[PDB]
């Protein structure tokens, strides 16, 4: 939500 | 394991963090 | 963490964040205990009153973190769960007795300046350190107050409290598998764990060998940082046989 997106790979 | 509990940026370098001494001092 | 401070870089390199895949959010804290095993609270993973029941594929483990929300490129590592193990006698119905779980990682995580395992106590260390007035340290990215959320990992040091004081502070039934920690109203200082800090470690630095041991797991409380209330922690040493049994049987 407030979190930065992690690399799609994970 | 062998090296558990020894932090690279503190114990492994003989550096103390800012409040670990408060713990030491309570171990009376 | 209520009334704590920002952690230093590398101060708690065993700190793990349990992260929900969708919607992407913090679920709990946790601790790294070797290159493929993470320790947490059972209630982080299973709590039927709240319709909580996560499976391996619901979750990710994020290791080496400082910042709560940021993706910490070149520093954090993100791992998938191979298997979850919850204590077979975890008491979710009543008082969270035996509030402990293990998570096995799909692949071993690489240790670094920011990623390193904490020790689990042996009988002698626990006997020597688990004494009223002795301080441990709790860390997490949970709420800053009992009502916001921190930008970075928070830390607070708290004294173990005598068992009759723990008992008289609540109406919940306290077991030998729990301890409580925190300052008394008279003691002035304050601080506590809070929601979001769940599953994270209560650590002490052994003065015998200057290694950090995880004595507790953040488990439960009534409010956060209330005068006359104390945070409750799963007693790691008491449940050690189950921990080793699991790791020994599932390598
Ligand atoms: C039924 C239990 C014994 C009490 C309940 N308030 C509780 O704490 N629960 C009910 C289900 C999960 C757990 C929780 O919220 N843990 C988070 C938490 C809350 C407070 C603290 C604290 N130290 N103040 C720590 C963790
Ligand atoms: Na009571
Ligand atoms: Na309190």
């Amino acid at each position: 939500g407030d979190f930065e997106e992690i690399p799609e790979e994970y | 394991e062998a090296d558990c509990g020894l932090r690279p940026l503190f114990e492994k370098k003989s550096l103390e963090d800012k409040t670990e001494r408060e713990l030491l001092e309570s171990y009376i | 963490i209520v009334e704590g401070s920002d952690a230093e870089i590398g101060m708690s390199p065993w700190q793990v964040m349990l992260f929900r895949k969708s919607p992407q959010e913090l679920l709990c804290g946790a601790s790294l205990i070797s290159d493929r095993w993470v320790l947490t609270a059972a209630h982080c993973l299973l709590y039927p009153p709240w319709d909580k029941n996560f499976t391996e594929n619901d979750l990710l483990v994020r290791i080496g973190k400082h910042s709560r929300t940021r993706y910490e490129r070149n520093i954090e590592k993100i791992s998938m769960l191979e298997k979850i193990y919850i204590h077979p006698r975890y008491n979710w119905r009543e008082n969270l007795d035996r509030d402990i779980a293990l998570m096995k990682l799909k692949k071993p995580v690489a240790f670094s300046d920011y990623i390193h395992p904490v020790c689990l106590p042996d009988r002698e260390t626990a006997a020597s350190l688990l004494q009223a007035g002795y301080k441990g340290r709790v860390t997490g990215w949970g709420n800053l107050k009992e009502t916001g959320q921190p930008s970075v990992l928070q830390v607070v040091n708290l004294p173990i409290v005598e068992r009759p004081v723990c008992k008289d502070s609540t109406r919940i039934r306290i077991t030998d598998n729990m301890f409580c920690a925190g300052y008394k109203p008279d003691e002035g200082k304050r601080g506590d764990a809070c929601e979001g800090d769940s599953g994270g470690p209560f650590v002490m630095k052994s003065p015998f060998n200057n290694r950090w041991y995880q004595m507790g797991i953040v488990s439960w409380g009534e409010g956060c940082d209330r005068d006359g209330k104390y945070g409750f922690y799963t007693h790691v040493f008491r449940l050690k046989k189950w921990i080793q049994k699991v790791i020994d049987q599932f390598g």
Side-chain angles (χ1 to χ4, degrees), chain C residues 92-157:
Chain C
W92 50 267
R93 296 187 158 271
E94 198 206 339
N95 55 358
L96 258 39
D97 198 22
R98 311 191 196 79
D99 191 10
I100 193 167
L102 288 159
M103 300 173 279
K104 168 98 167 193
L105 306 183
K106 223 167 256 188
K107 321 198 154 174
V109 62
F111 299 162
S112 76
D113 281 349
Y114 319 99
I115 298 173
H116 201 85
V118 72
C119 301
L120 298 188
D122 68 354
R123 169 169 261 297
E124 294 72 58
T125 294
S128 183
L129 294 184
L130 283 176
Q131 309 195 233
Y134 281 32
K135 286 181 199 187
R137 172 178 290 170
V138 177
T139 44
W141 293 284
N143 296 352
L144 296 162
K145 334 217 135 50
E146 202 211 318
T147 283
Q149 314 161 300
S151 167
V152 306
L153 187 71
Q154 300 289 294
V155 190
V156 69
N157 310 325

Side-chain angles (χ1 to χ4, degrees), chain C residues 1-69 71-82 84-185 187-210:
Chain C
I1 302 291
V2 40
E3 286 294 310
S5 89
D6 289 10
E8 294 173 63
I9 301 312
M11 187 191 219
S12 178
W14 37 79
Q15 189 69 31
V16 172
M17 171 187 299
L18 298 197
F19 194 67
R20 188 187 192 171
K21 289 204 203 171
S22 174
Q24 282 198 164
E25 66 198 352
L26 165 79
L27 216 104
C28 265
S31 65
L32 187 67
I33 58 166
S34 68
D35 58 21
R36 39 205 329 185
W37 287 94
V38 175
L39 182 65
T40 190
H43 83 259
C44 284
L45 297 167
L46 169 70
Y47 195 66
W50 291 359
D51 289 313
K52 197 141 106 241
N53 199 162
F54 290 105
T55 189
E56 293 78 0
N57 261 288
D58 287 331
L59 310 171
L60 292 160
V61 144
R62 308 170 65 174
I63 318 165
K65 286 191 61 56
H66 188 60
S67 176
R68 183 171 69 77
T69 51
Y71 176 66
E72 294 182 281
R73 195 161 42 97
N74 286 12
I75 292 175
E76 63 167 290
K77 297 304 176 239
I78 303 201
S79 306
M80 297 174 230
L81 277 95
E82 179 173 307
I84 291 168
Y85 308 82
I86 296 201
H87 205 105
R89 304 188 69 190
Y90 163 49
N91 196 343
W92 50 267
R93 296 187 158 271
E94 198 206 339
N95 55 358
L96 258 39
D97 198 22
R98 311 191 196 79
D99 191 10
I100 193 167
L102 288 159
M103 300 173 279
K104 168 98 167 193
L105 306 183
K106 223 167 256 188
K107 321 198 154 174
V109 62
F111 299 162
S112 76
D113 281 349
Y114 319 99
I115 298 173
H116 201 85
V118 72
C119 301
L120 298 188
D122 68 354
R123 169 169 261 297
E124 294 72 58
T125 294
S128 183
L129 294 184
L130 283 176
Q131 309 195 233
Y134 281 32
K135 286 181 199 187
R137 172 178 290 170
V138 177
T139 44
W141 293 284
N143 296 352
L144 296 162
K145 334 217 135 50
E146 202 211 318
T147 283
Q149 314 161 300
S151 167
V152 306
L153 187 71
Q154 300 289 294
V155 190
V156 69
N157 310 325
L158 306 166
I160 295 165
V161 173
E162 299 86 347
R163 186 154 304 264
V165 177
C166 296
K167 288 189 185 141
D168 289 351
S169 79
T170 174
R171 304 172 65 165
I172 302 287
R173 181 170 63 88
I174 298 86
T175 61
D176 285 351
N177 304 311
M178 302 173 192
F179 69 88
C180 90
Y183 293 102
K184 302 139 111 131
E187 274 167 339
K189 325 213 217 184
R190 58 193 319 119
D192 192 6
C194 198
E195 174 182 275
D197 290 326
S198 289
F202 181 100
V203 301
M204 305 176 86
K205 190 167 167 169
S206 168
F208 303 99
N209 64 185
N210 292 310

Side-chain angles (χ1 to χ4, degrees), chain B residues 5-21:
Chain B
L6 303 170
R7 304 168 286 176
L9 252 20
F10 292 98
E11 289 76 21
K12 174 192 205 180
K13 278 170 94 156
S14 205
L15 287 179
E16 286 179 11
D17 71 51
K18 284 151 164 165
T19 58
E20 54 177 275
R21 169 134 293 204

